[PDB]
């Protein structure tokens, strides 16, 4: 359950992310691949090297999915339904891995938004990413 | 755990710039705020009703200083974390019965605090090295469960 | 997402549990306390010894909560709302522990219902208990 | 890991009654059915489209026999699980990159299979002893991550 204060906090922090959203998604992916190398096996056809155009393009897709979730925070199962089908059915992503990407997204936000990443906003963003992760794993 | 010389370099250079009187309290406070069930273990700390009360709590800052000192001790003994954390493992496992998943959580909160404090300096390779460290500390703290 | 087949499977298996529900809840609790001793710290005022009347009485409460969840499987957040408030706010139960009790409930069902505990029903019961656990942890 | 003599007794007496040609396939099949993302690692096994296809799959039964033999080997070396599972750890960690959380899952599925097969014989104290074993096996299999 995202509280009213949580939704306000998530809107504010992601709103300050602005047009960097694509770049931050790519950085979170690189953080995950380097910190948690098991996650790399899901992208054998990617070049995962730094500066990879495939990682940059994918990070924009990830950021756009989160932006969609923020914009439809009261209706996330519906908004992310096609994405949950993809991850669970076709890609068969291990649910553990959503915790890893969520952590790397928080680290990325912390490293870029020193003013916004207060303890209260940190708590709200963690609950938001946990809620997104719950939706994306709901379809095994 | 085994860090490469480049990983050791990245970790050591950043840790020498950490404010050891504050970062521990910041990580512990955020743990209590973000993962509220951990407040079960700190009933004697007083007002934890709000995030500002947690981060401003003097007992939280004081205890976080001890937690950070333990991480510093781990950084100095990266290939004997088990012996380093033996008495701490018996405390947390045999007497407090903290679930070891929370050791991983606190480690990840520390990583978030370091990213917040150091910004772009906390590069993805520097993070990857710190994830190895906090994973090794968590595993050593949990050895009395193992 | 519990599928239609999952709801049918859970109804059938729990329906065969019958009036043993109270006893099975108490056995699952004992299984958890012995297998995962960290869980005992939540019950310092309980006598956790075998045959304890407090564990027997509590196991009936647990079974009745699951029976309520089965009977309202399409509306579990509402049915379990007061229970989720209790576990998250007052008791501050570590979310890890719901996985432990869910596992011990499956073990208890497996040990008592050899005919019902097929792989398909095992999968459905695991999803059901994960759904109950998600509701009970939704309120931190 | 350390079992008491009574724990060792409970585990050994039950394991001597296990059908070693079937229980491994039963646990592996149930892992693939209950935790469907694990099917990612078994693409070469053929039809896994339904529970009946999984449990009736001959490659699942055959491979489950090897998995059960590894558990049997662990039961015989309860205080050198790390050395026992060293080559298995390198396979699962360095080459397959299976997340170690799935080692815990398979261990818990095995416990469910034993409860199903032995019924009331699989008492809470007998289970508690088996949880120590499967936790020790999972930890040893994950050492190459540690
Ligand atoms: C917050 C969590 C996540 C979000 C918002 C997310 C979002 C997305 C999006 C938007 C796509 C592209 C959909 C399309 O192009 O049709 C995608 C694809 C994909 N995702 Fe995720 N994802 C998340 C977590 C993960 C995790 C944890 C993994 C594995 C470790 C993963 C693995 C993949 C893979 C392998 C693809 C296919 C990439 C390709 O073949 O081009 N995702 N994801
Ligand atoms: C990396 C993880 C952790 C480290 C390095 C750590 C470190 C420490 C240290 C150095 C002490 C002081 C021991 C002494 O005074 O001699 C301590 C005490 C304590 N820790 Fe932690 N800790 C960790 C995780 C946790 C977590 C996650 C919790 C609860 C959720 C927790 C609960 C406690 C409690 C209640 C005490 C006080 C025990 C007492 O005074 O008797 N610890 N810890
Ligand atoms: C499927 C999961 C669970 C269900 C259905 C459940 C259900 C219940 C119910 C019905 C009650 C009594 C409510 C009342 O009397 O007002 C209760 C109380 C309680 N539960 Fe749970 N519970 C679950 C998981 C857990 C877990 C995992 C823990 C901790 C390891 C836990 C700890 C407690 C405690 C400490 C109480 C208070 C007991 C007392 O003081 O009398 N519960 N639970
Ligand atoms: C307690 C946990 C486990 C044990 C004891 C175990 C045991 C084994 C054994 C004995 C082998 C055969 C190695 C050989 O042929 O020399 C094997 C292979 C394999 N295991 Fe596991 N396993 C475990 C968990 C898992 C899990 C959870 C997965 C996937 C989700 C997995 C995936 C595989 C794969 C893909 C192979 C084939 C590797 C190859 O042939 O190159 N294992 N395992
Ligand atoms: S790759
Ligand atoms: S992704
Ligand atoms: S602590
Ligand atoms: S107790
Ligand atoms: S409970
Ligand atoms: S396996």
Swiss-Prot record, chains A, C:
Instruction: Name the consequence of residue 14 to R.
Output: In Evanston; O(2) affinity up
What happens on changing residue 15 to R? In Ottawa/Siam
Result when mutating residue 6 to A: In Sawara; O(2) affinity up
Please describe, based on the UniProt annotation, the reported consequence of changing residue 72 to R: In Daneskgah-Teheran
Q: List the CDD domains.
A: Hb-alpha-like (cd08927)
Give residues where N6-succinyllysine occurs. 7, 11, 16, 40
Q: Which residues carry this modification: Phosphotyrosine?
A: 24
PTM annotation (N6-acetyllysine): residues: 16
Phenotype for residue 102 to R: In Manitoba; slightly unstable
Result after altering residue 6 to V: In Ferndown; O(2) affinity up
Phosphoserine modification sites are 3, 35, 49, 102, 124, 131, 138
The UniProt-reported impact of residue 74 to G is: In Chapel Hill
Listed result of changing residue 34 to R: In Queens/Ogi
Give me the Gene Ontology terms describing cellular component.
blood microparticle; cytosol; endocytic vesicle lumen; extracellular exosome; extracellular region; extracellular space; haptoglobin-hemoglobin complex; hemoglobin complex
Resulting phenotype, residue 18 to R = In Handsworth
The further comment given in this record reads: Gives blood its red color.
| Subunit architecture | Heterotetramer of two alpha chains and two beta chains in adult hemoglobin A (HbA); two alpha chains and two delta chains in adult hemoglobin A2 (HbA2); two alpha chains and two epsilon chains in early embryonic hemoglobin Gower-2; two alpha chains and two gamma chains in fetal hemoglobin F (HbF). (Microbial infection) Interacts with Staphylococcus aureus protein isdB.
Protein name in UniProt: Hemoglobin subunit alpha
Q: Which organism is it from?
A: Homo sapiens
Swiss-Prot record, chains B, D:
- Which disease is noted in the annotation? Heinz body anemias: Form of non-spherocytic hemolytic anemia of Dacie type 1. After splenectomy, which has little benefit, basophilic inclusions called Heinz bodies are demonstrable in the erythrocytes. Before splenectomy, diffuse or punctate basophilia may be evident. Most of these cases are probably instances of hemoglobinopathy. The hemoglobin demonstrates heat lability. Heinz bodies are observed also with the Ivemark syndrome (asplenia with cardiovascular anomalies) and with glutathione peroxidase deficiency. Beta-thalassemia: A form of thalassemia. Thalassemias are common monogenic diseases occurring mostly in Mediterranean and Southeast Asian populations. The hallmark of beta-thalassemia is an imbalance in globin-chain production in the adult HbA molecule. Absence of beta chain causes beta(0)-thalassemia, while reduced amounts of detectable beta globin causes beta(+)-thalassemia. In the severe forms of beta-thalassemia, the excess alpha globin chains accumulate in the developing erythroid precursors in the marrow.
Q: Impact of changing residue 121 to Q on the protein?
A: In D-Los Angeles/D-Punjab/D-Portugal/D-Chicago/D-Oak Ridge
Q: Mutating residue 29 to D has which effect?
A: In Lufkin; unstable
| Consequence of substituting residue 30 to S | In Tacoma; unstable
Q: Which effect does the record note for changing residue 92 to N?
A: In Isehara; unstable
Q: In the record, which positions carry N-acetylvaline?
A: 1
Q: Which organism is it from?
A: Homo sapiens (Human)
Site described as (Microbial infection) Cleavage, located at: 7-8, 25-26, 29-30, 35-38, 45-46, 52-53, 56-57, 71-72, 74-75, 84-85, 92-93, 104-105, 110-111, 119-120, 122-123, 128-129, 140-141, 144-145
Instruction: Summarize the impact of residue 71 to S.
Output: In Christchurch; unstable
> What happens when you mutate residue 139 to K?
In Hinsdale; O(2) affinity down
| Protein encoded by which gene | HBB
Globin domain boundaries? 2-146
State the family it belongs to: Belongs to the globin family.
Which residues are annotated as modified residue N-pyruvate 2-iminyl-valine in the UniProt record? 1
Outcome recorded upon mutating residue 25 to D: In J-Auckland; unstable; O(2) affinity down
Q: What is the effect of changing residue 1 to A?
A: In Raleigh; O(2) affinity down
Q: What is this protein called?
A: Hemoglobin subunit beta
């Amino acid at each position: 359950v995202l509280s009213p204060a949580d939704k306000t906090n998530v809107k504010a922090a992601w709103g300050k992310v602005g047009a960097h959203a694509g770049e931050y998604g790519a950085e979170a992916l690189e953080r995950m691949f380097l910190s948690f190398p098991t996650t790399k096996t899901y992208f054998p056809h990617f070049d995962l090297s730094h500066g990879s155009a495939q990682v940059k393009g994918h990070g924009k897709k990830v950021a756009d999915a989160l932006t969609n979730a923020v914009a439809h925070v009261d209706d996330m199962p519906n908004a992310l339904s096609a994405l949950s089908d993809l991850h669970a059915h076709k890609l068969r992503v291990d649910p553990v891995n959503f915790k890893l990407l969520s952590h790397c997204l928080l680290v990325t936000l912390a490293a870029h938004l020193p003013a916004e990443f207060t303890p209260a906003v940190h708590a709200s963003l963690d609950k938001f990413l946990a809620s997104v992760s719950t939706v994306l794993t709901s379809k095994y | 755990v085994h860090l490469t010389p480049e990983e050791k370099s990245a970790v050591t250079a950043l840790w020498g710039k950490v404010n050891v009187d504050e970062v521990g309290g910041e990580a512990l406070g955020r743990l209590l705020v973000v993962y509220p069930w951990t407040q079960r273990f700190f009933e004697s700390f007083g007002d934890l009703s709000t995030p500002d009360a947690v981060m401003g709590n003097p007992k939280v800052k004081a205890h976080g200083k001890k937690v950070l000192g333990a991480f510093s001790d781990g950084l100095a003994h990266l290939d004997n974390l088990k012996g380093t954390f033996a008495t701490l493992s018996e405390l947390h496992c045999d007497k407090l019965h903290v679930d070891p998943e929370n050791f991983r959580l606190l480690g990840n909160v520390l990583v978030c605090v370091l990213a917040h404090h150091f910004g772009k300096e906390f590069t993805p390779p520097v993070q990857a090295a710190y994830q190895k460290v906090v994973a090794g500390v968590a595993n050593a703290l949990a050895h009395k469960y193992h």
